[PDB]
Amino acid sequence: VNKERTFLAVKPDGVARGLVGEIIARYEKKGFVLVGLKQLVPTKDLAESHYAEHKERPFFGGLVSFITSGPVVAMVFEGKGVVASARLMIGVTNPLASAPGSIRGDFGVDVGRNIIHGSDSVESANREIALWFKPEELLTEVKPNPNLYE
Amino acid sequence: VNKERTFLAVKPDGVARGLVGEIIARYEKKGFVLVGLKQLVPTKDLAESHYAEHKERPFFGGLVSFITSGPVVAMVFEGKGVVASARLMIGVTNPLASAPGSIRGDFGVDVGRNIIHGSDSVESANREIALWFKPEELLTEVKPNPNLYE
Amino acid sequence: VNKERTFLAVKPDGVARGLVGEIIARYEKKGFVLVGLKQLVPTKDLAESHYAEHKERPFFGGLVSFITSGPVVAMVFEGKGVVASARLMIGVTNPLASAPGSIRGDFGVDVGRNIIHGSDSVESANREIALWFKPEELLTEVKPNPNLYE
Amino acid sequence: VNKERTFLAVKPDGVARGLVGEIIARYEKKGFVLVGLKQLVPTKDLAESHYAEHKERPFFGGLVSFITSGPVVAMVFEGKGVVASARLMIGVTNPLASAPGSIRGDFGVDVGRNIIHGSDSVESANREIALWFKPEELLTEVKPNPNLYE
Amino acid sequence: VNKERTFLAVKPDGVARGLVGEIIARYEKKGFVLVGLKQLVPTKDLAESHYAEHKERPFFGGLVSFITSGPVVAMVFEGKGVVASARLMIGVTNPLASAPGSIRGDFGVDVGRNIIHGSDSVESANREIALWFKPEELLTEVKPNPNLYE
Amino acid sequence: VNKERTFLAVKPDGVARGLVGEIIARYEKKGFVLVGLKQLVPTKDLAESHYAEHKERPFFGGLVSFITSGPVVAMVFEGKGVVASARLMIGVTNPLASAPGSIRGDFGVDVGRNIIHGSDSVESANREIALWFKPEELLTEVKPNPNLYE
Ligand SMILES: Nc1ncnc2c1ncn2[C@@H]1O[C@H](COP(=O)(O)OP(=O)(O)O)[C@@H](N)[C@H]1O
Ligand SMILES: Nc1ncnc2c1ncn2[C@@H]1O[C@H](COP(=O)(O)OP(=O)(O)O)[C@@H](N)[C@H]1O
Ligand SMILES: Nc1ncnc2c1ncn2[C@@H]1O[C@H](COP(=O)(O)OP(=O)(O)O)[C@@H](N)[C@H]1O
Ligand SMILES: Nc1ncnc2c1ncn2[C@@H]1O[C@H](COP(=O)(O)OP(=O)(O)O)[C@@H](N)[C@H]1O
Ligand SMILES: Nc1ncnc2c1ncn2[C@@H]1O[C@H](COP(=O)(O)OP(=O)(O)O)[C@@H](N)[C@H]1O
Ligand SMILES: Nc1ncnc2c1ncn2[C@@H]1O[C@H](COP(=O)(O)OP(=O)(O)O)[C@@H](N)[C@H]1O
Secondary structure: OOOOOOEEEEEEHHHHOOHHHHHHHHHHHHEEEEEEEEOOOHHHHHHHHOHHHHHOOHHHHHHHHOOOOOEEEEEHHHHHOOHHHHHHHOOOOHHHOOOOOOOHHHOOEEOOHHHHEEEEOHHHHHHHHHHHHHHHHHOOOOOOOOOOOO | OOOOOOEEEEOHHHHHHOHHHHEEEHHHHHHHHEEEEEEEEOOHHHHHHHHHHHOOOOOOHHHHHHOOOOEEEEEEOOOOOOOHHHHHHHHHHHHHHHOEEEEEHHHHHOOOOOOOEOOHHHHHHHHHHHHHOOOOOOOOOOOOOOOOOO | OOOOEEEEEOOOOHHHOOHHHHHHHHHHHHHOOOEEEEOOOOOOOHHHEEEEEEHOOOOHHHHHHOOOOOEEEEEOOOOOOOHHHHHHHOOOHHHHHEEEHHHHHHHEEEEEEEOOEEOOOOOHHHHHHHHOOOOOHHHOOOOOOOOOOO | OOOOOOEEEOHHHHHOOOOOOHHHHHHHHOOOOEEEEEEEEOOHHHHHHOOOOHHHOOHHHHHHHOOOOEEEEEEEOOOOOOOHHHHOOOOOHHHHHEEEEEEHHOOOOOOOOOOOOOOOOOHHHHHHHHHOOOOOOOOOOOOOOOOOOO | OOEEEEEEEEOOHHHHHOHHHHHHHHHHHHHEEEEEEEEOOOHHHHHHHHHHHHHOOOOHHHHHHHHHOEEEEEEEEEOOHHHHHHHHHOOOOOOOOOOOOHHHHHHHHHEOOOEEEEEEOHHHHHHHHHHHOOOOOOOOOOOOOOOOOO | OOOEEEEEEEEEHOOOOOOHHHHHHHHHOOOOEEEEEEEEOOOHHHHHHHHHOOOOOOHHHHHHHHHEEEEEEEEEEEOHHHHHHHHHHOOOOOOOOOOOEEHHHOOEHHHHHOOOOEEOHHHHHHHHHHHHOOOHHHOOOOOOOOOOOO
């Protein structure tokens, strides 16, 4: 189904660095639709839940602190395989090991400031969407360029 | 004093031609700070309230009928003379008459499908901002690049 | 009418300099359709007729010589106001006086190597199309993105 | 010896998504010389003759039915291992699986609408070139950038 | 002559914003040749000599303090009419007044930190070029592209 | 440490093709800081010392002759893991083998003229950096962007 959605959030570093458009631009070009988008400064409460699975790791502290140290451009893209393609496009956890051509590969250098977050799977995509987005903020009627899909 | 704001909004034809990234990136490279942002489908009420000044104009008709036929990305940016600088970057009403390097100049071709809206005067920015944006959807502690202003 | 066509030809200098895609790219983005396109090395006979109105000027010699000293990517774009918009996008005769953002302004430096040629009016557009293009080489069925025109 | 050629062709979905410039520019920046080029609407004959190797495959069906539903930009480039290098730049069959930086990787999302075709082996280039191109539509006196080869 | 030269300098606010490459590439694109290039930190001496003409002018204070406040990438480009062309590409004194397409229009918003200085006349160029560069650093051998000048 | 340094050099074939700005901007984009920069023409001495390791290696002949055959833009970038990251961005020895996204994959097609050299290890970097640069040319003051490193 071409309804697969994912959740992306350009953190306070891709934001203060002037990358919001560049990043969105890359997904628009691939062929994915933007079904939600907004700017907000994440709450500790939202930071801790967003980052639930890292509750016990040394860096969870360093994480939530930063992800709410400024604005975050949260968004949702839809399309076939969107969840895995986005990751692929994002790169790997460490910017320095990210191949050139991927968001992290091209602009990233330090794991702590690795620019963007993208759902690792449909399940977390959905936990992430619902969580940041109230169903009203999303689109419903969606048909990207009929030259994308057969 | 470096806090001037304008409300821009990419219309259904910009948002659907996959130009939200490009457009945002342009003001972003210029140096203005994004202070609000959100996708949505405008309502006849807010749209007709937007085009108040064009009520009896023969085009107000299909004007309101287009900024509600799909998604709109609203936004507010901030910095020195952003209001005047934005329009300049947008171009002129007729995209065919806009200079290359401007937004309508580079991607527009018809007056109905002229891609983006801008605030023509502070008074008007402040007026369209409050329309589209609630007071708690816009940043406050701002800090543009420290290399940007003297 | 959205059938206005124009004739553009990237001369042997925009060609050997690696500009064909860049140049085409700019017209595709503005919103114009490509109704014909081909590579060929112009004939003296075609050069002299193409450049008919400069038959008596000192440079006509220097012109036709060069315009057939190599391959030329001849093309035809269609859309509203295509003839005048293209010129505007091309710049002025002298690259050095061409505003930045226009093809000549950005890549041009010497009038003799000013990169591209674009019809100055419908009348020469048509004399130029017919002349380089046999009606069979052009398209007929044409509808660009319905987000360009109202 | 530096004369290898491949026949690439931007399909109805690339040509219609306004990607002929971008695609051409990529091989152009790489260093290959364009040695032929032409837009056109392929015929069932030449198309089915193109996809000969896929005759009984369940997709040959709507395969031939798409490369004839609109315009196609055929082209031939030339240089060292262009044949192998082209494919690499194109990506892999599934656009979702193509790496960012490649053509299908950056703009594709479905296998039916995968944008561009390429020659997978010299023997196959030479085979598709002669199909689409008459012997008098391709350059002969070629001279790539003098800084390009040793 | 195709051997005119201008002295350009990406100011500290330019070097700090990651603009060196972009700025340099705009020029390499137009067709000018890099004859001189180097990063240094201007000594108060050089800044006073270089910005001499504005001594009695009030703002001399900032121009020099600011300009010595960090690294500078000094450049000397050669080319037919480079002096007047380069300043055109730069835009006007106020980045808010500069039009899109020019270095200051695309990137700057405040007069105090307007990214780049460029020689205003062939008078100031040779003056500034000698004051910031030494005969041995500047190339004597220039091979102007044949597809550039006639 | 965020103070590792690599020595990069755009070879003659790179300077001649108008690639300095692009190459430099790829690095400024990633997040590395330019610490050293200058254009010179390598003396046969420097080229032999610099390319020493390949003496017994056959192709020593070309590497040095070619590398002295024109201007060079010498660079020294600083950054966490710059050495290994920079070589990754460059691609592999053969530009035909390099993947899109890297300097050599996007731009080169022949091993002999592969545009840029980059230090292979922190061992070779400090060696090469001292041999091509002088303590006074290299910045001592570095202010690494806060949105870059944690
Ligand atoms: N080694 C670590 N040191 C510091 N921060 C880390 C480390 N590992 C992960 N993080 C950070 O928090 C996130 C960890 O999530 P995960 O490891 O799943 O990566 P990804 O973001 O690719 O899903 C990273 N994105 C990064 O900001
Ligand atoms: N003659 C016209 N026909 C159709 N649409 C028009 C016409 N004049 C203006 N409009 C449309 O309505 C909007 C009118 O606002 P205004 O004329 O102030 O433009 P701007 O966006 O430059 O402020 C335009 N953006 C355009 O889409
Ligand atoms: N002053 C001149 N010296 C040399 N070549 C010239 C001169 N004037 C015009 N040409 C050349 O031939 C063409 C002249 O046509 P025209 O003057 O109408 O310019 P355009 O190409 O803008 O229509 C130019 N494009 C340029 O290559
Ligand atoms: N499973 C499939 N379903 C739909 N279309 C397919 C499938 N396999 C291949 N095709 C289509 O037919 C072409 C088949 O050729 P091939 O598989 O050799 O691809 P490539 O373009 O990588 O050589 C593709 N480009 C694609 O559009
Ligand atoms: N009104 C001003 N306030 C502050 N600094 C200024 C002012 N006007 C000029 N400057 C600075 O002085 C610089 C050099 O001189 P000038 O203004 O004559 O030429 P240009 O502006 O083209 O460089 C400018 N580039 C700008 O950085
Ligand atoms: N097979 C070869 N034929 C010609 N020149 C070569 C060959 N292999 C290497 N070179 C040149 O020698 C250079 C420097 O050394 P090396 O190949 O060890 O590292 P790198 O290739 O990463 O620079 C290469 N960059 C390339 O320009």
